[PDB]
Amino acid sequence: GSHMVGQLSRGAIAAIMQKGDTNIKPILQVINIRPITTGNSPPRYRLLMSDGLNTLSSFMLATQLNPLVEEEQLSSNCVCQIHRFIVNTLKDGRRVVILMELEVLKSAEAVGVKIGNPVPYNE
Numbered sequence: 001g002s003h004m005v006g007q008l009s010r011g012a013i014a015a016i017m018q019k020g021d022t023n024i025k026p027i028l029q030v031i032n033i034r035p036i037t038t039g040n041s042p043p044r045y046r047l048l049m050s051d052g053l054n055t056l057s058s059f060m061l062a063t064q065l066n067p068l069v070e071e072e073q074l075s076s077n078c079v080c081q082i083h084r085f086i087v088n089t090l091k092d093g094r095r096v097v098i099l100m101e102l103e104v105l106k107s108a109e110a111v112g113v114k115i116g117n118p119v120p121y122n123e
């Protein structure tokens, strides 16, 4: 409906990256998905997601959610609610947000566009 950016949890990306609170169940839009280089292990998918204000490319799907990308409705433009996630930190200090449980609220085809004008989160 109208006010599309209101469909997303504006501020959730900053909340995740600055507060590290995991009790939230934010609604985010998938902007892009791509495999990361693995080899000799199940594929892993990285997501560029948006909360309407910011985008962040630090998301990775838990492997248990791979079928959503491979078989069902998880692709660019879909709107999802994250029901469970954890933040992990690499040795170099970069954070990786692992999505453990997510629900597709609106399919890519039902949304069809990048909502709002989100800008990259700097961190």
Ligand SMILES: Cc1cccc(-n2nc(C(=O)O)cc2-c2ccccc2)c1
Pocket: 035, 036, 037, 046, 057, 058, 059, 060, 090, 094, 095, 096, 097
């Ligand atoms: C920090 C971050 C967040 C999300 C994805 C990535 N990432 N992207 C790629 C890739 O090949 O594109 C590889 C990684 C990676 C993840 C964990 C450890 C080492 C590398 C990195």
Ligand SMILES: Cc1cccc(-n2nc(C(=O)O)cc2-c2ccccc2)c1
Pocket: 060, 061, 062, 063, 088, 089, 090, 096, 098
């Ligand atoms: C210690 C640490 C730091 C960052 C990410 C993780 N991590 N957690 C999961 C998971 O699915 O739970 C998967 C990874 C991962 C491991 C190697 C490369 C890319 C991602 C673990």
